[PDB]
């Protein structure tokens, strides 16, 4: 079957016995920066295996009423082994990613998750004439939570799922690369995102290249199904990471 699938990057391998397909960016596989597209003149570092491998973030629990979750991206992997170290030491960085969201349940459970990568997901403030916080935006690994109602508070993102923190119709998030995890048919989602930005390279602390959102559209449900615990786990692997402008490490 084509439900079966394996992926290997560095010293790490992922497997599934129930995959859908694999979505690829806007049809573009990651590539390293070409000479006719570059401006930064110094030799890049391309750690390769030490850096382009699967990092697993802390899992989250899918509850019968979870609104959703999100993660900002280059930031979030900032403490992941050498990928993070290379971030701290360089002014410029560039990478693509293989994102693998995992969630298994049973033939007697039901629910459906939308898994999307939104490039440049600028978010709005709860306090309409106020401004956000970096904290209201991301908490590294972990994950911010969407909300079922309008939120208040200065600095926090106006997170009612319904508008995805961006002021649009959540049900239109599909123009972005994505897959669905429909428990009855599927147990994981895989998206390969290429580097997307309006400049060839960028600083990885100052700019969230894209946001990963996991939003349940049909809620988790089950019966005397002595399994109420249904976790979701995000594993991601940088691809073609290259860095420029080496100097002392950035201030935490």
């Amino acid at each position: 079957s084509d439900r079966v699938r394996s992926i290997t990057l560095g010293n790490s391998t992922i497997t599934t016995q129930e995959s859908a397909n694999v979505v690829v960016g806007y049809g573009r596989w990651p590539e390293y920066l070409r000479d006719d597209e570059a401006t930064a003149e110094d030799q890049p570092t391309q750690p390769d295996v030490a850096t382009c491998r699967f990092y697993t973030l802390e899992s989250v629990t899918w509850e019968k009423d979870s609104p959703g979750w999100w993660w900002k991206f280059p930031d979030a992997l900032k403490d992941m082994g050498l990928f993070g170290q290379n971030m701290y030491y360089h002014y410029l960085g560039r990478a693509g990613y293989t994102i693998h969201v995992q969630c298994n349940a049973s033939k007697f459970h039901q629910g459906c998750l939308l898994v999307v990568c939104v490039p440049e997901a600028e978010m709005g403030c709860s306090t309409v004439d106020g401004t956000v916080n970096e904290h209201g935006l991301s908490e590294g690994e972990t994950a911010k939570k969407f909300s079922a109602t309008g939120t208040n508070g200065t600095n926090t993102v106006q997170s009612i799922v319904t508008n995805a923190g961006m002021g649009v119709g959540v049900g239109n998030l599909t123009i972005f690369p994505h897959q669905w995890i429909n428990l009855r048919t599927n147990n994981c989602a895989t998206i390969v995102m290429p580097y997307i930005n309006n400049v060839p390279m960028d600083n990885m602390f100052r700019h969230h290249n894209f946001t990963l959102m996991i939003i349940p559209f049909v809620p988790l449900n089950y019966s005397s199904d002595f399994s109420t615990y249904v976790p979701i786990t995000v594993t991601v692997a940088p691809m073609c990471a290259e860095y420029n402008g080496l100097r002392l490490s950035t201030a935490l």
Binding site: S1, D2, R3, N21, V22, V23, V24, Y26
Partner: protein, 60 residues
């Protein structure tokens, strides 16, 4: 040193073209490219590796 190309067809199923000459030194000064009509829905409606033949199951 001019260019002749065809007009967008109007009210009926040789005199259906126009001529143009650029008078400025910068491409920015030129008129719009209202006649270029390419298309590639694929980037968006079907960005799956592993070609989906759809007349076949899609899973299995």
């Amino acid at each position: 040193g001019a260019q002749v190309s065809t007009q967008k067809t109007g009210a009926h199923e040789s005199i259906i073209h126009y001529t143009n000459i650029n008078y400025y030194k910068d491409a920015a000064s030129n008129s719009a490219n209202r006649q270029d009509f390419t298309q590639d829905p694929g980037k968006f409606t079907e960005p799956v590796k592993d070609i989906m033949v759809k007349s076949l199951p899609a899973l299995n």
